[PDB]
A paper describes a structure:
To address these fundamental issues that define the primary function of these channels and their role in the symbiotic process, we performed functional characterization of the [name] channel and demonstrate that it functions as a [name]+-regulated [name]+ channel rather than as a K+ channel as previously proposed. We also determined the high-resolution crystal structure of the ligand-binding soluble domain of [name] and reveal that the entire soluble domain consists of two tandem [name] domains that assemble into a tetrameric gating ring where [name]+ can bind and regulate the channel. Our high-resolution structure reveals multiple [name]+-binding sites in the [name] gating ring and provides structural insights into [name]+-regulated gating of [name].
The [name] soluble domain was crystallized in the presence of Na+, [name]+, and Mg2+, and its high-resolution structure allowed us to identify multiple bound ions clustered in two locations within each subunit. The protein crystals had a space group of I4 and contained one subunit per asymmetric unit; four crystallographic symmetry-related subunits assembled into a tetramer with the molecular fourfold coinciding with the crystallographic tetrad. Cluster I contains two bound ions and is located in the cleft between the two N-lobes. The [name]+ binding at the Ca(I) site mediates extensive interactions between the two N-lobes that lock them in a fixed position relative to each other. The anomalous signals indicate that only two of the bound ions are [name]+, labeled as Ca(II) and Ca(III) sites, respectively.
Residue numbers in the entry:
A (entry chain A), B (entry chain A), C (entry chain A), D (entry chain A): 320 to 698, 727 to 852
The structure:
């Protein structure tokens, strides 16, 4: 049957269905079964009111428990190509307890499983046990942790928010892995310029057991069994072609500039916030500052952090500044040096996160107050976490939409890993402080003002600093272009254009 | 279709339906659609048991969510003349979060909206964001704040309670705005006496973009496009006629008397009570006193007030007296100087307001205790907030009814703004400490004992102190008369009669 | 229609239905309508499973709200002979808030009411307001307060528990009021011996507006319009007959003995316990002691009591001893001088009373522990409050049943007042510390050992100390006999027999 | 009808049904009726999805309350051979309050009961009252207390977990009591070797009123009316046969070795944990240590223990070590000397036990952390309580299953006592610190290396130290064998084999 099976119901279900409909469109549609502990007719009513285009995909609803074998047989569990275990809205530990029981149930199916299991985990501290009992069958996506990592990346580089939304979801372009036997024996530097409609980003190396190497050496020779990781519009839109003519040349300003210290504000005590502090300490330049404004009394913050595994005495790049107060109280916020922050993250506080409507209401209240306080005392990225994707969609015609990062990104990550389990490791590396990551780079590293050259020519210059050039944003364009369709044609570039690369630190 | 659409269900729904039925009666009835997340047959059952006269208006019920476009299409959202977003019973922040999502949903309707959106807001701190995203489509009515303002006005002038109930609801007379081209070129002083069945109160000034000027200058000349604001019995009961014969004369006692200080008691810590203290400080004579009797420890009251934006060190007219105690405990209440207060407001405490039945039970318990304590220690307006309009209606044949102000006034305000969005600014001014307000004035300012004159003659005398005379209450009458039908006939007035005016401070 | 209408559903409903079925049996049955906010078919199912004999009474169920006039019309509210407003299980203030709204609704019925309204009140502090708005239509029975008073009476006189159960319910004999014109002009002392099958206890005095005088003067002459209060088996079982021959004689030992001090234990902090302490202080001999064992810290008990209106510095007969502890913890209980108490009351603690199953579980746990502690440290009335009548009935074949007093007594009181509203004042007096009350008296006051005399002869001796003799308990009988059928026959009495009287203090 | 009647519904129902199906299989099936306060069709749906073999037993579902006689008649309460009162999931006191009311209801059935009542009690402190009112009809199984006792036994002797699971459930072998008149007059030492397919363990002694004597004297002569207690595969698989030929011989090493002190860790504050500490103090060698790691502040632990009846100053064999911390926080756990414990019990904490899914999630989190901490600091039985049997079953293909003891054992105990009420006393003795218990013993007490002998010959040697030999575990076998089928055949034993005995201390 090779359908997608979704176990559960949550605020993320509609956005996940939308992603899978987009992924299936190139096939003419596919089949999705949803099984939840709800009345089947109510499920069908809700699905029938969803406002996106199903693009030929059929959605079937069944009522039942993932712990009951007779219920799993109702949705042909052993023939699904992927099984997605959706987290329950509300308390993270309760959702993760259900996830563990569900994975154990699925591993007990005696006919076996045709596909893999994608588990939406709500708390990092519960991931190891799920991975232990799920073995080779399971991929975990820790929703809470991924969102924290993306918020930090987008706070540090404004403009990555749009890029990450584009790449993590199936609209526009995204990562695909495919085997191309006709490229066996070619150097990676030539593979890079072999696809009119794709940008190679890595190689699945057969001699390493299928490990994906992002940003490999230009001198790597593709071997039998290797596969290519690309960014492309869809799984079927790209193919290798004869090598184009690409002039070679040197980087004008191949410089590493001293990184300046950053001052970041976190509003709210997020569950497991020590994990975000760890990521930030590994990401910022020395002498940076993290301010934490929240209602936890200062004298007890250290215990929370040390109990979460963070030794603040051994932070390398950041100093911590603690301020106590209520993030929806104007008087408390205005005591902060709001104008001095390079970025401000408004986080879902652990005291209210179990209710998405309450958490999101507080986050938007804080956003409005920070903006209004600053406007009123006239003579900085602000990013606000939104837990319900519906609220993000409802904000989409407002200016507010530019200031929010939502759990829709979790639905996108789940759909990516459902469609190819191997992409989970690629995303993990790009979300991690180690290895490769995405960066937005000024044009004067790569070219001179008005220089006439092709995207491929810039790409080959970028290889001289070990970067994969994946896109650009033109000086007065609203949106970056990833995997630009016109790669061989020459244009006149501006020093105000910017380039999007995958790069090591 | 031009129907009224109500989104939601609450304790206020019946009283709102009643108001709209009264407003529609002059048309022979209209149509109201109610959509809520309830079983349609249960909604219909409840509507069919409501005890007021529908007066030809038809009520249609549908089950659905205001965030779901297919549900909005079921109630012809794009053809409604007004959409009313009713607050949810219970927690104010949760209700306001729903309100914001609903306004965003309505603004997303791609066919557009024929009418305006009236949003019942539960907390003033959430109003700005709703106004920002709703733009030109939205009128907000902040129920909690309006009730606080009305309680203060009625505590300061006993007898305004009946007047405000009469004017804010569609029974008796109320505000209407209409264009009268035949009055172009006339002075406002002549417009004032041009309507046998109405009292002009202001002008919608076309050259100010349609801003309504309450109580304009007698010398203002009506221009093309201007409209007249009147108080009248219904939208169609009044029209201009030839100018009547009105004797002119002077005010006998056009004096401004020194205002005496007032001592006011607030029982209970109302949510956002600092907003009421602000209004009171701007309303009372110097050297006045506000006593706050409630269970919040004295040492922490200042923080609550400063966090709500109130700087008590810069109050101009009132001193604050703090007493700690439980407002349903006789022993605590009897320590207060109950006999010395000019007025006592029994407020819904923020600790119980999320349950209307609990809050109203405490308010009535306090009312009875205050009266009984005073009666028992024999050898003052008391106003009690009631959150459920049903309880106010059930009290209507009891003496208790004279001591209660209820959320029925919110239903009336919502219906007024639903019927003409421009009235929201008029009500805002009359509820505000700035600009014009209603006052009850002694007769000896305007006439001598037994003087024989017409209502119009008194009105023209009142213009000499920049007042609009809107009604009277005769010396031994139970009720004031607003917009009295007999305006040209002479009667013999008593110095014990009183006059109702709109006036600046 | 003249039916009984019950508004509500609670744990007391079955026992109330049983009482009304017993009261109606002499008519051949009657009709009871029950209206509650429940599914009608579920109500009917529950009624059809009740295990007592309906004795010809028909029970009709309807679904609806007592605040909705259309629902009240469904149960013919204006034709009912009595309307009983049953308290809701759980929180007392919420139940009383519903009661107030229901009384207001009933007073608004424009066709008027044929009968009276009996309101089950849960908290004494809410009674005055209900009485104020209900006027002449309402009788209140404050369930919580009545049970406290009965527990004190039964703790002080073991054997009154069975007597009160017999008299307050319709099994056996109970109070009836009826007019007997043929007794006009007779002295009360002769009325007393005029009814073979009843005992006159008082007179409804027409010249006092129908006030019932319990235990009147023997010389009172019945006037036209007066009615007789009797104890009898049923409303129709008794009638006056020619005066019997009754020998007169003197009391052998008409002595008042010095009352000895009592030591009483209250286990648990009962809601409004100050009301019980007040009753006890007025009931006990000087130098008595009340021990209060409960978990409220000693330092804060005084505030609870003074806030409830009790001035402990002005207690007349009791001293208070405070002990802190948990009444289900053996170690805490065994620190008490359990063997030294004249009686122990195990009260439903205010911390758990909102759940009858939890409260009753704690009360029975305490009962078992007190008995077991005493038995284990070998080399006193114990009375336990039970909130659910079903639990009392389930205990009825156990020895435990002798140690429990339950809310079934509330159902009995409600049925008594439903059947004749005038009985509420009689019960109030007998439950009150003022006026008349029931007492169990030793035989040697009235007769000598082996004296051969009739019940009537003893009754006339008892009149010489202003007592109404209503029954006896023979030396080795399990049960007292009230209104004994054989009143003229002589028997040989024992000084070990006891007599039941109504008497002033 | 002689069916089994189960009153209630809980997480244990499926495992109880499975046990009863196994017990009934030898009859070809039987009948089980389940009555709960649930929709009958939902009950039937759930039963129809259970995944074990019903083995010919029919399950009938009815909706109803055990307190309602009409409902009890629907399931033929008076003809059932056993009635099982299943505890409610969640709060123990509420479940036990229901149990008491249900037992009272059953004792009120006027047709009487054919069988006995098995009551699942959740808290030991509530057992005495249930036993008092249930009299001769009731057997109580205190689930919480039994699980604590089994966890201690299995922590002290690894390998008893599998043995107890085998013997307490109906798979494999278990205890049976039956009368064998042909054995009257035989000595117990000969009865012991009379059953090819069973091991006699005790005698039901008719002259003691039917008291079961476990491990009687070899010289006891069976009398008329006595019955034999055996371990056998099923009730019908065993019978006496002529005495086999059994060589006699002496024990090689009949030594009592000095018992070494043990160090035990309890993680979590279990409800009524003092009861486990009492059992442990009576079970361990002198100078043993109990460490209690949990979040209760040290200064208040003593009160909890003394209020539960434990005098820590008079412990005989253990010292208590108190550590404060959170059992799911790695940093707190790693401060413990984890490597030094002879056994670690992870207990369901009283703060979360009312939710089985939360409690079990914490227990598994602690298990994983303890194992991972130890593995990570490289250059001991661990037993975890699981409250939901479904979770234990879901873990059954994981290694984790070896580390869990679950409430499935409660279902097994309930089924054992349902099938023969007399087994409750046998289990009580084996679970008690007094009398006989099961022990795993080294082979060199009984035989020499390579000695060729039969199981019966070893059994008769074991009688010389007053032990009943019930099974063995061979040196490299995964599982012990209880009641081995091949008892007369000789094999060559290893000093690495172990023997399972019933023995006094
Ligand atoms: Ca595709
Ligand atoms: Ca965590
Ligand atoms: Ca795409
Ligand atoms: Ca109208
Ligand atoms: Ca506010
Ligand atoms: Ca009107
Ligand atoms: Ca009768
Ligand atoms: Ca009270
Ligand atoms: Ca009777
Ligand atoms: Ca069997
Ligand atoms: Ca306990
Ligand atoms: Ca077996
Ligand atoms: Mg962690
Ligand atoms: Mg504010
Ligand atoms: Mg009181
Ligand atoms: Mg105990
Ligand atoms: Na994409
Ligand atoms: Na990375
Ligand atoms: Na009006
Ligand atoms: Na104003
Ligand atoms: Na009676
Ligand atoms: Na009395
Ligand atoms: Na077994
Ligand atoms: Na034992």
């Amino acid at each position: 049957q090779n359908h997608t099976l979704i176990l559960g119901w949550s605020d993320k279900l509609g956005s996940l269905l939308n992603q899978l409909a987009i992924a299936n469109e190139s096939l003419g549609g596919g089949t999705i079964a949803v099984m939840a502990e709800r009345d089947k007719e109510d499920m069908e009513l809700d699905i029938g009111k969803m406002e996106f285009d199903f693009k030929g995909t059929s959605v079937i609803c069944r009522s039942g428990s993932p712990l009951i074998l007779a219920d799993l047989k109702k949705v042909s569990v052993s023939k699904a190509r992927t099984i997605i275990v959706l987290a329950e809205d509300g308390n993270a530990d309760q959702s993760d307890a259900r996830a563990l029981r569900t994975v154990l149930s699925l591993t007990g199916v005696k006919e076996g499983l045709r596909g893999h299991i994608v588990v939406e985990m709500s708390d990092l501290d519960n991931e190891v046990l799920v991975k232990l009992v799920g073995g080779d069958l399971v991929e975990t996506v820790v929703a809470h942790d991924v969102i924290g990592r993306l918020m930090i990346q987008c706070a540090r580089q404004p403009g990555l928010a749009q890029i990450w939304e584009d790449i993590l979801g199936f609209e526009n372009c995204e990562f695909y892995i495919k085997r191309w036997p006709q490229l066996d024996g070619m150097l990676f530097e030539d593979v890079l310029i072999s696809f009119p409609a794709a940008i190679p980003c890595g190689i699945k190396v057969a001699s390493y057991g299928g490990k994906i190497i992002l940003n490999p050496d230009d001198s790597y020779v593709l071997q039998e069994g290797d596969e290519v990781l690309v960014i492309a519009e869809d799984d079927d839109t790209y193919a290798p072609a004869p090598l184009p003519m690409v002039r070679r040349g040197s980087l004008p300003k191949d410089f590493v500039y001293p990184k300046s210290p950053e001052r970041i504000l976190f509003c709210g005590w997020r569950r497991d916030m020590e994990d975000m502090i760890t990521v930030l300490d590994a990401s910022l330049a020395p002498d940076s500052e993290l301010w934490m404004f929240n209602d936890v009394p200062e004298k007890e913050r250290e215990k929370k952090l040390i109990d979460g595994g963070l030794d603040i005495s051994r932070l390398e790049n950041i100093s911590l500044v603690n301020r106590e107060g209520n993030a929806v109280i104007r008087r408390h916020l205005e005591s902060l040096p709001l104008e001095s922050f390079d970025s401000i993250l408004i986080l879902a506080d652990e005291s209210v996160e179990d209710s998405a409507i309450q958490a999101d209401s507080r986050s938007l209240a804080t956003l409005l107050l920070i903006r209004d306080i600053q406007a009123r005392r006239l003579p900085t990225v602000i990013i606000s976490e939104i837990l319900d994707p519906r609220t993000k969609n409802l904000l989409s015609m407002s200016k507010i939409s530019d200031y929010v990062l939502s759990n829709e990104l979790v639905s996108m990550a789940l759909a990516m890993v459902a469609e190819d389990r191997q992409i989970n490791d690629v995303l993990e590396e790009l979300f991690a402080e180690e290895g490769n990551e995405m960066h937005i780079r000024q044009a004067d590293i790569y070219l001179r003002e008005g220089e006439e050259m092709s995207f491929y020519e810039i790409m080959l210059r970028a290889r001289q600093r070990r970067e994969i050039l994946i896109g650009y944003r033109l000086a007065n364009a609203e949106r970056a272009v990833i995997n630009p369709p016109a790669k061989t044609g020459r244009r006149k570039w501006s020093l105000k254009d910017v380039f999007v690369v995958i790069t090591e630190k």
